[PDB]
């Protein structure tokens, strides 16, 4: 519980999102140069973006 509380406090602290990834409800977007291969495994839900590097 202590570790979880510390993690949640870190999440709720101040700052910004410094990554180019932002959530959308349409689909799960995968960067071009990510090691993930889930898009090849599945047939629906995941979309790979070529311009996202």
């Amino acid at each position: 519980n202590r570790w979880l509380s510390s993690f949640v406090s870190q999440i709720m602290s101040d700052g910004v999102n410094e990554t180019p990834l932002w959530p959308q409800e349409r689909y799960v977007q995968i960067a071009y140069d990510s090691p993930s291969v889930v898009d090849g495994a599945t047939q629906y839900g995941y979309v790979r973006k070529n311009q996202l590097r």
């Binding site: 910004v16 999102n17 410094e18 932002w22 311009q51």
Partner: peptide
Amino acid sequence: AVGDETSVTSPGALRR
């Protein structure tokens, strides 16, 4: 800005 706007915080979010 690549894709969404009002989200430009990293150099990797821009394209010519």
